[PDB]
């Protein structure tokens, strides 16, 4: 507080200072004061002329200010799930803010807002408690992902779900006794309320799981109610949604809550898109709930490498709840004895001897030949490579921008665990241990490079170095699998798993080595402009040291140097222009015929590939990227001056030479 | 004539008035003082005659262990003076101070949708090094550029 007043003594003691000196603590250290607010300018603070709305609940709402509020609250909490903080998204709603601080009115006579709207608001708050303590589970990042700060609010932790299930079922037995006595276009609005209540009673059964059948029958209900809700959203025209946004909505509610950061003015998406996000929520929560049928330990490893190959990055609640559903699996033992998950991946892939690993108890036998003679190497390799497979499971619940740089930080740890694996394998790059950790090392490199392309950080005059490096690690990984599936010590169940994994890689390599032939074709027809500054040697030495920086420091696989990758392009730039077309027309034809022979082939009678590996829509997305890329190589074969372009369709991994 | 000036302390009150109006990021007054009270020989100011057409603000520390890293903190020009050739002899004058003092990398973060100042930095030799998911407080991502001189 402040008791003695010195204002005149302050404004003549600061005006006697020097030009740019500060009277601060000796331990103030100006780096600390760079997150401070500057209270009197906008975009720093938010308390300039607030006037907190005087909500005045004592007023009956018709059945159109109820349906418009039911759509404004759902569109408010579905954009807290995708970013924006709880203040100025959901607490700005003046009904949620009245509870997170019976009915709404004090003079309780139970009008049609306490019977209908009040059990809805109680369920949105109760849904935002089950979601909120999933956000605090430590599987995401606190500001890149969700802003999960609860502004000293209480989301009804002591409200029983039995009382909430009876208030909310009573609202459906009240509305169904009034559909029959209203008209023909009001009745339409009440049956649009009745679907928004039964969407909230179905979303609530997804958040508390409590079984596995009633959370899939509820996810099949969300996908049916949303098309019937999204067409009756255009009933609240323009002036009911304006006369309740100034009466029951306070957009500046940050001006009375605890500030942790300046006002993040995140642009809203609307009511039509926020119901699409519930269809997006229910569509990939159905994918994660299929990870209870994974009947092996190599399928668990690949379900998380296909999950990061999605082209949508589902939702922070859906991502962070993958870690809770992939440990509780009852087919592999994660989160208690997790070193039996690493040994089960190696017993399947290459096979362990029967005097070293007992698969009926999933542990190393205590006193054997190897584990007692070479003691501190076996206990060192097992501890080092468990902290990679368990770490790789923690990385799938990440945004693709930090999934990548958590794989880059993992490459100095696979390099250690590969070095003390091929030193143990002489005491039994082949063998049981070092042939799986090399496969994990090579799948990590292919996911670093492919996600560096889909993040659009290889500007298009730098494709031909990327597509020459990418099919050099595809070529090493392909002659490593077929050298391992040609062995005699590998088990015959995973001899036909490698040659199914090798036919998938052969279809991906043949469609990415067809883009090296297409970029060189487009760079000489000036469809891809090669600018004047890139032909500097001190600049292209920094282009290569910035992208392929982790891959150069490795010695296994052999890195493709810059002076070596420039001899692949130069040996391919001295073809003719009408000869590069017919050479790229055969590389996508061979990639089209090899992609349809995988997505229609069986590939699921094997136990441990990944049965849900076509539902990520990756192998069929770059099947359309080699069909529509093939209908314009015929146009280009007629005239070499056709006005084609490289488009960047956002639902696709690869760009395509598309226009006319 | 447009000259580049090595930042005396008189241009601080104009730097805050310019950068606050065209850079969508909320800096306070003690953010500029963190870069210019410790590294004042890396920031430059461009004048028309005496008129303050834009400025650049930089720093140069040792990043983690030994990599001496320059960092272009913020750069803007008034809207009436863009396109002419200012802020490429203003930021090149800042790229020469942190090259003769021996930096081994020069990084900067720019917005993803901001195209007029991400096709500008590629003209100087910078290329995209990382992508930062929802870096700024608009939900917009950011690219991290780098140059190895």
């Amino acid at each position: 507080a402040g008791y003695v007043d010195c204002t005149k003594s302050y404004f003549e003691a600061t005006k006697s200072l020097k030009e740019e000196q500060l009277v601060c603590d000796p331990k103030f250290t100006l780096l600390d004061s760079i997150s401070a607010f500057e209270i009197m300018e906008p975009k720093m603070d938010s308390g300039i002329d607030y006037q907190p709305l005087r909500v005045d609940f004592s007023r009956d709402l018709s059945y159109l200010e109820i349906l418009a509020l039911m759509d404004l609250i759902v569109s408010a909490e579905k954009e807290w799930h995708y970013g924006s903080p709880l203040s100025e998204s959901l607490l700005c709603s003046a009904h949620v803010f009245s509870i997170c601080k019976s009915g709404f009115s004090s003079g309780s006579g139970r009008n049609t807002t306490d019977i209908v709207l009040f059990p809805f608001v109680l369920a949105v708050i109760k849904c935002c408690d089950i979601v909120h303590r999933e956000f605090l589970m430590g599987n995401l990042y606190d500001e890149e992902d969700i802003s999960s700060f609860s502004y000293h609010m209480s989301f009804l932790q002591n409200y029983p779900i039995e009382k909430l299930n009876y208030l909310l079922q009573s609202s459906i037995e009240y509305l169904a006794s009034e559909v029959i006595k209203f008209s023909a276009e009001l009745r339409q609005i009440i049956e649009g309320i009745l679907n928004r209540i039964q969407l909230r009673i179905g979303i609530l059964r997804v958040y508390e799981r409590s079984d596995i059948k009633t959370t899939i029958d509820a996810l099949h209900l969300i996908k049916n109610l949303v098309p019937e809700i999204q067409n009756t959203v255009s009933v609240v025209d323009s002036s009911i949604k304006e006369s309740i946004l100034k009466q029951y909505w306070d957009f500046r509610v940050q001006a009375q809550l605890v500030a942790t950061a300046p006002v993040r003015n995140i642009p809203p998406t609307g009511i039509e898109h926020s119901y699409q996000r519930i269809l997006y929520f229910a569509d990939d929560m159905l994918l994660i709930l299929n990870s209870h049928t994974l009947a092996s330990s190599l399928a668990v490893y690949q379900f998380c490498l296909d999950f990061t190959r999605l082209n949508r990055t589902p939702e922070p609640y859906v991502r962070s709840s993958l870690q809770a559903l992939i440990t509780a699996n009852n087919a592999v033992n994660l989160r208690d004895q997790p070193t039996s998950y690493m040994l089960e991946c190696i017993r399947e892939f290459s096979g362990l001897p029967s005097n070293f690993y007992n698969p009926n108890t999933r542990t190393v036998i205590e006193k054997n030949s190897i584990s007692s003679a070479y003691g501190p190497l076996v206990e060192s390799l097992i501890a080092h490579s468990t902290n990679i497979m368990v770490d790789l499971v923690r990385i799938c619940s990440h945004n693709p921008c930090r999934f990548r740089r958590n794989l880059i930080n993992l490459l100095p740890e696979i390099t250690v665990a590969h070095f003390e694996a091929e030193a143990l394998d002489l005491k039994f790059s082949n063998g049981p241990f070092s042939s799986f950790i090399y496969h994990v090392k090579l799948n990590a490199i292919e996911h670093i490079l492919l996600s560096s392309f889909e993040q659009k950080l290889h500007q298009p005059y730098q494709w031909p170095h990327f597509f020459a490096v990418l099919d050099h690690v595809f070529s090493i990984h392909q002659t490593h699998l077929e050298l391992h599936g040609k062995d005699r010590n590998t088990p015959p169940m995973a001899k036909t798993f490698v040659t199914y994994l090798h036919r998938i890689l052969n279809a991906i390599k043949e469609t990415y080595s067809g883009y090296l032939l297409l970029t060189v074709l487009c760079m000489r027809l000036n469809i891809i402009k090669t600018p004047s500054f890139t032909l500097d040697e001190k600049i292209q030495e920094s282009y290569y040291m910035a992208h392929y920086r982790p891959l150069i420091n490795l010695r296994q696989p052999k890195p493709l140097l810059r002076s070596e990758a420039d001899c692949i392009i130069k040996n391919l730039q001295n073809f003719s222009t009408d000869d590069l077309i017919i050479k790229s027309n055969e590389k996508f034809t061979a990639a089209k015929n090899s992609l349809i022979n995988v997505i229609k082939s069986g590939f699921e009678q094997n136990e441990f590939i990944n049965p849900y590996f076509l539902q990520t829509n990756y192998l069929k997305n770059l099947l359309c990227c080699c069909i529509t890329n093939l209908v314009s190589l015929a146009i280009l074969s007629k005239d070499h001056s056709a006005n084609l372009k490289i488009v960047e369709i956002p639902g696709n991994p690869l760009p395509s030479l598309s226009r006319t | 004539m447009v000259t580049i000036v090595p930042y005396s302390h008189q241009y601080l009150k104009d730097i805050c008035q310019l950068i606050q109006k065209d850079l969508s990021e909320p800096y306070s007054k003690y953010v500029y003082r963190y870069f210019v009270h410790q590294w004042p020989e890396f920031s430059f100011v461009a004048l028309d005659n005496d008129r303050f057409i834009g400025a650049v603000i930089c720093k140069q520390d040792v990043h983690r262990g030994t990599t001496l890293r320059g960092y272009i903190a913020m750069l803007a020009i008034v809207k009436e003076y863009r396109g002419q050739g200012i802020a490429t002899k203003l930021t090149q004058a800042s790229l020469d101070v942190m090259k003769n003092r021996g930096a081994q990398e020069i990084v900067l973060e720019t917005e993803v949708d901001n195209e007029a100042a991400m096709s500008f930095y590629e003209r100087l030799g910078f290329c995209r090094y990382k992508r930062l998911y929802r870096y700024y407080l608009n939900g917009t991502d950011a690219f991290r550029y780098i140059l190895y001189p």
Binding site: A261 | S24, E25, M74
Partner: peptide, 4 residues
């Protein structure tokens, strides 16, 4: 622009 210096991010947060």
């Amino acid at each position: 622009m210096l991010g947060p």
